[PDB]
Amino acid sequence: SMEMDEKDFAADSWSLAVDSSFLQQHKKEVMKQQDVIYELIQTELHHVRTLKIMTRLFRTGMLEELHLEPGVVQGLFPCVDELSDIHTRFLSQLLERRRQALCPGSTRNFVIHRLGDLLISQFSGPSAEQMCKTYSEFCSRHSKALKLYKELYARDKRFQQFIRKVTRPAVLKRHGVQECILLVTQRITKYPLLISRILQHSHGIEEERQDLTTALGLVKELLSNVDEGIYQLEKGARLQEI
Amino acid sequence: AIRKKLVIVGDGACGKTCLLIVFSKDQFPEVYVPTVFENYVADIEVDGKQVELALWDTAGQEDYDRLRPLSYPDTDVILMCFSIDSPDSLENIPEKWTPEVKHFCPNVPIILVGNKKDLRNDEHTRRELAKMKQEPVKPEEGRDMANRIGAFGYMECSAKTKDGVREVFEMATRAALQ
Numbered sequence: 001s002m003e004m005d006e007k008d009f010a011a012d013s014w015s016l017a018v019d020s021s022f023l024q025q026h027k028k029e030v031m032k033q034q035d036v037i038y039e040l041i042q043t044e045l046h047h048v049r050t051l052k053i054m055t056r057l058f059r060t061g062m063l064e065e066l067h068l069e070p071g072v073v074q075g076l077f078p079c080v081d082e083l084s085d086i087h088t089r090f091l092s093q094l095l096e097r098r099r100q101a102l103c104p105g106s107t108r109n110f111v112i113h114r115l116g117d118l119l120i121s122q123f124s125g126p127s128a129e130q131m132c133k134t135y136s137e138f139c140s141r142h143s144k145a146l147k148l149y150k151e152l153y154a155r156d157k158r159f160q161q162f163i164r165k166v167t168r169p170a171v172l173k174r175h176g177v178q179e180c181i182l183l184v185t186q187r188i189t190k191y192p193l194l195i196s197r198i199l200q201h202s203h204g205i206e207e208e209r210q211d212l213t214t215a216l217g218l219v220k221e222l223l224s225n226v227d228e229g230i231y232q233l234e235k236g237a238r239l240q241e242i
Numbered sequence: 243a244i245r246k247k248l249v250i251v252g253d254g255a256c257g258k259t260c261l262l263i264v265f266s267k268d269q270f271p272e273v274y275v276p277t278v279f280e281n282y283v284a285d286i287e288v289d290g291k292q293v294e295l296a297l298w299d300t301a302g303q304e305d306y307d308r309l310r311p312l313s314y315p316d317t318d319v320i321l322m323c324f325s326i327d328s329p330d331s332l333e334n335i336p337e338k339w340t341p342e343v344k345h346f347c348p349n350v351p352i353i354l355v356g357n358k359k360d361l362r363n364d365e366h367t368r369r370e371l372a373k374m375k376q377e378p379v380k381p382e383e384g385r386d387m388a389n390r391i392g393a394f395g396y397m398e399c400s401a402k403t404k405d406g407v408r409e410v411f412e413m414a415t416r417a418a419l420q
């Protein structure tokens with residue numbers, strides 16, 4: 001992550017991120033909607049950060065320090081470049097929507113009134129097709145990635161020393177290789193929970209309530225498609241077993 | 243310190259996300275309660291043993307039968323949650339959650355946890371339940387279900403007041419060490 005975005009999302013809520021003199025000017029219903037929108041952006045920022053630890057810290061570090069065969073590194077981090085592209089782009093739009101909403105003279109006071117339109121765009125058309133295809137591939141390769149990790153850590157000394165070195169800082173406590181893989185798999189099922197709670201506090205504008213209802217239906221359609229397209233791959237599985 | 247993994251399972255409104263948030267923050271959040279829980283690695287010392295307990299939630303995965311089991315690999319302890327204000331969440335334990343957890347986590351200890359124990363003394367809760375010929379889950383009903391499914395043990399808690407929360411996680415750590 002970058003310092004600018006970390007400070008903007010350091011607070012536990014939107015009501016603690018904005019100036020208290022700006023908070024006072026708003027209705028509690030707006031504060032509640034903004035707190036949930038802020039949680040969605042803050043967790044999207046953490047999700048992209050998880051993907052950067054996988055591509056830059058783990059994957060590239062293995063390629064440059066261990067000179068591990070790229071097919072092994074690919075098996076450990078399937079679709080990480082594609083996932084990083086999809087979520088970094090989505091995050092850029094969420095961050096730009098917040099930036100545009102800032103008051104002049106302020107880097108923290110903002111109200112996001114429109115979100116449904118961005119959520120319909122992300123979860124429809126080509127971008128939705130790419131998320132469905134990428135998560136179906138990722139989640140089908142998830143178990144194999146974990147077994148490959150466990151084999152290498154237990155039997156390779158240089159790989160074990162690499163892992164222990166890169167995961168030593170306290171900021172990486174919940175971000176080991178297996179933890180990153182499960183954090184990524186679980187991300188997609190957080191979207192309907194966050195969007196439903198945003199919808200609960202977005203009845204003030206009828207068009208926004210309609211856009212969030214549409215976005216919710218699109219995320220559920222995507223999740224159902226990803227779930228149906230999954231079949232766990234096994235390393236060295238025979239045709240007779242498939 | 244040894245590394246252990248804990249996963250919480252249960253119906254959508256069983257209060258599992260609130261339980262994980264309250265333990266990881268070590269208090270009931272006063273300004274805003276988060277909608278979701280990502281993960282957390284707790285530093286716990288139980289009975290003289292130091293453990294790193296990784297905490298995971300299955301909230302949002304209840305309708306996705308092929309995504310949900312991806313949370314199960316290498317689990318050391320399962321917390322199987324139900325809500326005391328929801329007797330219908332208790333009946334889903336034996337024939338939905340128990341067969342799934344025994345298939346994907348064989349020989350993993352299960353702790354049956356009765357959440358929202360404070361609602362046993364809530365008037366609005368008792369009135370809404372009496373309209374459907376129901377009442378809050380009794381302590382003996384929770385213990386009998388835990389006995390029936392072969393649970394390691396039965397525990398109760400309240401994320402709202404923090405009562406029994408620390409004890410649940412210390413016992414889960416002891417269960418993961420056996």
Ligand SMILES: c1cc([C@@H]2CCCNC2)c2cc[nH]c2c1
Nearest residue numbers: 307308310311341342343345346
């Ligand atoms: C949930 C449950 C199961 C099995 C089948 C029924 C008994 N319990 C275990 C599977 C198998 C694949 N995905 C699953 C999700």
